[PDB]
């Protein structure tokens, strides 16, 4: 088999940078490498074949190289869409071999969250559970810290958060955080808070609701 | 237009074979060879072999030579992989792609366990909450307790794709996921537009259609 050595694993770098990757091939492959891209949905598309051959289609600021068993792709001016991992496919002998790949992360700068706080549903309490949905969207950087308080006082244990890739348009992240009760142990209280805390804030920035009866 | 469709996401158990596909729409055997790719985190994309439409020829990368078995119909114009004695290591994606790997499916999630499938429940995630936000506001669906992933989202049957964000599932004590997908929308329109969530959850057959409106108070 032959070996396709793919550096860096990862590389992040700012908006408009010149990026390049590279992939060795242990044996002679004789320019027979193409270079795809998967997307965060998990959409694969062969950006170039034959080392430095751009798909119909491909952008411009695309490019491949080769020296020796040194391939490289190169992204003039990275952009918010070229978020991906990128593979290279070497189709010279079988078995066909890929690269490693290189995670690209994009550098940007600071954004505040927009929080939203939901209430259960009611359908959802006749379950007998209740969801908590606190919402920070389109933040940078990654780092936030969500704090759920119930009549103000500090929940833990019963929470859950998750926080997506990078936006494939403005490279920012968002986070979801959701705090399940029992439909008995949420009716037991008045006021249900989140507070989130983000570099993008000068202080923290608290969402909440008073479960009235409607 | 062209390209090529996988068959659904599906839980198998341990020891079992199962059958994978890959139907090309647009294009047929005539462009010849169709790949067959593994994918798990943190592992990136193996070959796994190709076959020759057009006359039943097999390549297969030496690991998989006694595990993957793949064939080919050109009349329906399908591809099938076919995976024996299932363990673990064969939960993954697979992908299907065509020659020059330019065409590539969607990708199918083989999830490989002892366990029951279990449908999600479906919950909205109602705009304006208690009261309206300043100018925008954000809604949603709670896909919650399912197992396994993953699970597709869709807003207004594929109409809305703007400001969507659909979080990583987590996987809560009892062993099923839970998952969520937000919309920020404009607050002055809530009362003229129609905000529905498509849910789809293809290891159980669970297809859920959730209208996610403000509700009264
Ligand atoms: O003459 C031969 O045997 C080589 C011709 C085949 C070129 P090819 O179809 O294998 O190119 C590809 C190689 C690998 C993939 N892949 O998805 O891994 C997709 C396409």
């Known amino acids: 088999d032959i070996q396709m050595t793919q550096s860096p694993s990862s590389l992040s770098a700012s908006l408009g940078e010149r990026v390049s990757l590279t992939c060795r091939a242990s044996?002679?492959?004789?320019?027979?490498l193409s270079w795809l891209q998967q997307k965060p949905d998990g959409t694969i598309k062969r950006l170039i074949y034959?080392?430095?051959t751009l798909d119909s289609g491909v952008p411009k600021r695309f490019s491949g190289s080769r020296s020796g068993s040194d391939y490289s792709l190169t992204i003039s001016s990275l952009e918010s869409e070229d978020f991906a991992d990128y593979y290279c496919?070497?189709?010279?002998?079988?078995?066909?071999?890929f690269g490693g790949g290189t995670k690209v992360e994009i550098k940007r700068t600071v954004a505040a969250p927009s929080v939203f706080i939901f209430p259960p549903s009611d359908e959802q309490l006749k379950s007998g559970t209740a969801s908590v949905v606190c919402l920070l969207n389109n933040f940078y950087p990654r780092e936030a810290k969500v704090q759920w308080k119930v009549d103000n006082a500090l929940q833990s244990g019963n929470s859950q958060e998750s926080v997506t890739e990078q936006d494939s348009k403005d490279s920012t992240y968002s986070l979801s955080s959701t705090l399940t009760l029992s439909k008995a142990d949420y009716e037991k209280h008045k006021v249900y808070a989140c507070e989130v805390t983000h570099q993008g804030l000068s202080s923290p920035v608290t969402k909440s609701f008073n479960r009235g009866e409607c | 237009q062209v390209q090529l469709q996988q068959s659904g996401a599906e839980l198998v158990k341990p020891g079992a074979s199962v059958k994978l596909s890959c139907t090309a729409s647009?294009?047929?055997?005539?462009?010849?060879?169709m790949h067959w790719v593994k994918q798990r985190p943190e592992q990136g994309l193996e070959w796994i072999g190709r076959i020759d439409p057009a006359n039943g020829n097999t390549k297969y990368d030496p690991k998989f030579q006694g595990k993957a078995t793949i064939t080919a119909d050109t009349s329906s114009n399908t591809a099938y992989l076919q995976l024996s004695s299932l363990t673990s290591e064969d939960t993954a994606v697979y992908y299907c792609?065509?020659?020059?790997?330019?065409?590539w499916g969607q990708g199918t999630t083989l999830t490989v366990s002892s366990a029951s499938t279990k449908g999600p429940s479906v919950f909205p995630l109602a705009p304006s909450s208690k009261s309206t936000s300043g100018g925008t506001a954000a809604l949603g669906c709670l896909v919650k307790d399912y197992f396994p992933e993953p699970v597709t989202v869709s807003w207004n049957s594929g109409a809305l794709t703007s400001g969507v964000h659909t979080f990583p599932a987590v996987l809560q004590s009892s062993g099923l996921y839970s998952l969520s997908s937000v919309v920020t929308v404009p607050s002055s329109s809530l009362g003229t537009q129609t905000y529905i969530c498509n849910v789809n959850h293809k290891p159980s057959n669970t297809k859920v259609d959730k209208k996610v409106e403000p509700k009264s108070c």
């Open positions: 647009g294009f047929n055997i005539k462009d010849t060879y």
């Open positions: 496919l070497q189709y010279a002998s079988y078995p066909r071999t």
């Open positions: 792609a065509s020659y020059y790997g330019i065409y």
């Open positions: 044996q002679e492959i004789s320019g027979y």
């Open positions: 034959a080392a430095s």
